[PDB]
Amino acid sequence: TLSQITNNIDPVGRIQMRTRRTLRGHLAKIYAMHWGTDSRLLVSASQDGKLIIWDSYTTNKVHAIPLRSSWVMTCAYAPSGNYVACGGLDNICSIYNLKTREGNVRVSRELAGHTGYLSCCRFLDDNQIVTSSGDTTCALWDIETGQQTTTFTGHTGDVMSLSLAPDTRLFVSGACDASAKLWDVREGMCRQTFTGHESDINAICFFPNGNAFATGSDDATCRLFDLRADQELMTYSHDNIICGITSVSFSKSGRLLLAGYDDFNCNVWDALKADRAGVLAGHDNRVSCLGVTDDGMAVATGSWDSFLKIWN
Amino acid sequence: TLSAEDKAAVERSKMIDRNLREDGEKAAREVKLLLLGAGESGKSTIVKQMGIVETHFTFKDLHFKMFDVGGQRSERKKWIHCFEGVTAIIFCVALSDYNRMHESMKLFDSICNNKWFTDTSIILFLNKKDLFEEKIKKSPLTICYPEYAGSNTYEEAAAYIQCQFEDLNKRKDTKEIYTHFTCATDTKNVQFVFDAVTDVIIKNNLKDCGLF
């Protein structure tokens, strides 16, 4: 186990996460937000047809992007700092190119071809993009020309979101039949499948070494998992809470763990001693997605509040 | 001490934020008149004089929006988890091609007081209700229901459809269902749903302006 082996770890204390920066601006529900890579910029995706990337230091609006279709379920940000990636229901995976275009930011590829709604997208580099839809299957692509290069199958349900380990060469997937599967990016035979929930899994992210990951779900029972073991490793459950858990993201040290819930709190957890490490109130409504930086300096939450909040 | 060279870098944020908010202006001046159901649902003659689907039909000074999916118990997770702000559930239902009724029973048990869309407004239109008066006599609806506890007519039939929606409700009070007795389907329904959405926006005003 993890838990009965945790008999060596001295406790962590109580740390104030001070609510540093409050981001105004929106007018609707916000289904998605995600970072830059120099720990400074933040993409954000909300229901009213606009797409906003952000400079959290000086805290002012950098871009807002018109969509023609007003339905979002994801957006990703290329670690160059040139490509934003906005998804939707209508299977128009719209890749927009920021810097090199002069004035505008317009599409260069609408990856079309998914049958059902397009759930999650994540960038690798300026080359490809990994994507997940309602078509029970997922795919790696080639935006330089627009051919769906590789496509992997296996599930029996709609895919919800998708996740990388930052050495760029493995990916892991979550779909509504309580499935979390491993696929190597290049080959991708049906490697191994992960169960343990009963719910449609609604968030997953990876422990930043490249060796383990963790799943968050709306049956209020988060878990952590090895690359190899296929069974439960560490269970995460407030015994007094049965409203579910919407997003999840590890901190830089791997000592912490975020989780926003349905009762409008983000409990911060010790990643070691299975404790409520601290509490984040202040959300008007439900935490949609939370994001740690690439150095664990700040952390941020996007909710249904039409606001972003910056915790330190 | 930040008075240094970035007096465009915040000025840009004002220029983008005004045009950010003024997209919300011509948001919600419309409403969203959403097509639901299955085949034979009787919303083709509705959409006749009127991605997936939109439209832009207007009548008496109020531009409208309208969207479309179909095929319940698999299309549920779409709109419970990721729709929003619906003022119009057009639950058009086939009346001679069913089955798909406990479909509606467990669907309305799952939607009616769940935290995301407990505040839905489920409006049934028995489109081609002559097919319903034909179907209930060709087939007594005791095949679908144990607790058919009325007479042999249309009033208790349609009222019992309204029952068996909200028989799995079990803890709430009302929905105020605007059942257009749908005529020969080339019939004036635009005025019906017109002042129907007038009354739902009036009750949405009064729920949020003090007066009840």
């Epitope: 910029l41 400079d55 950098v62 700092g81 004035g103 | 240094a4 060279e5 970035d6 465009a8 870098a9």
Partner: antibody, heavy 121, light 113 residues
Framework: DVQLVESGGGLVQPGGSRKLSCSAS????????MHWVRQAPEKGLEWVAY????????YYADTVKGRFTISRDDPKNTLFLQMTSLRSEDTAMYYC??????????????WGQGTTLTVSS | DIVMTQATSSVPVTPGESVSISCRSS???????????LYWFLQRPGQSPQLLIY???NLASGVPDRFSGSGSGTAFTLTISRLEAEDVGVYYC?????????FGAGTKLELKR
């Protein structure tokens, strides 16, 4: 792609006035700021004027504050520069210069073809 | 106002070798934000100038990487790894700390024979 054609050069009688225009084409003229820059004969170059997005924020240099006028016409993509009280010490080639300002953004990164203004009898 | 300082004329460097040209400041141009706001311009004769180094540290679009910048808090120098036959011409320094902006004075890069 980008064409910044100046117009309005030539000879100007001293102390008089003149408007300049940069026919701008190929780039979204809204979200950019304009700079007027001047290059004298065999001298170091020098900043003159700034206009922002939103058509409001206006800056000048020392000698020509109050006598120059910078404006932009977004349906016409047009930088108007009305100069007044023109004297021999501004006989120069001028340029109109694209700008864009935010974090990780690149000011001045395009330049005009330039035009000649000459103040003499 | 704040004054930039150069050297006006310079040695024709041999085509094929490195070169370095300086410009320094009449005030500490580094602001508390973190990066000093300094500009290196190229102008060819009979042409219109494109920039080379924006904000003291970064090459621009359409410029090869031989234009390695060098910065103190106050003194600044652009170094070219190899003088090619087409980097001929006039160089300018121009700060961006406050308004208004003054520029440098110009420094010529020539050919040695």
């Amino acid at each position: 792609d980008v064409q910044l054609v100046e117009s309005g050069g030539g000879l100007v009688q001293p102390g008089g006035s003149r408007k300049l225009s940069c026919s701008a084409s190929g780039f979204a003229f809204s979200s950019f700021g304009m700079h007027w820059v001047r290059q004298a004969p065999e001298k170091g170059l020098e900043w003159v004027a700034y206009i922002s997005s939103g058509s409001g924020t206006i800056y000048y240099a020392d000698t020509v504050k109050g006598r120059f006028t910078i404006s932009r016409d977004d349906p016409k993509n047009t930088l108007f520069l009305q100069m007044t009280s023109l004297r021999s010490e501004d006989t120069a080639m001028y340029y109109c210069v694209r700008s864009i300002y935010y974090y990780g953004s690149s000011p001045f990164d395009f330049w005009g073809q330039g035009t000649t203004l000459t103040v003499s009898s | 106002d704040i004054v930039m300082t150069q050297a006006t004329s310079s040695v024709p460097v041999t085509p094929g070798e490195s070169v370095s040209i300086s410009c320094r400041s009449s005030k500490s141009l580094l602001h508390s934000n973190g990066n000093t706001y300094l500009y290196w311009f190229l102008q060819r004769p009979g042409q219109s100038p494109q920039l080379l180094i924006y904000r003291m540290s970064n090459l621009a679009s359409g410029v090869p990487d031989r234009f390695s910048g060098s910065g103190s808090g106050t003194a600044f120098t652009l170094t070219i790894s190899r003088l090619e036959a087409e980097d001929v011409g006039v160089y300018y320094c121009m700060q961006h700390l406050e308004y208004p902006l003054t520029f440098g004075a110009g420094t010529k890069l020539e050919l040695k024979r």
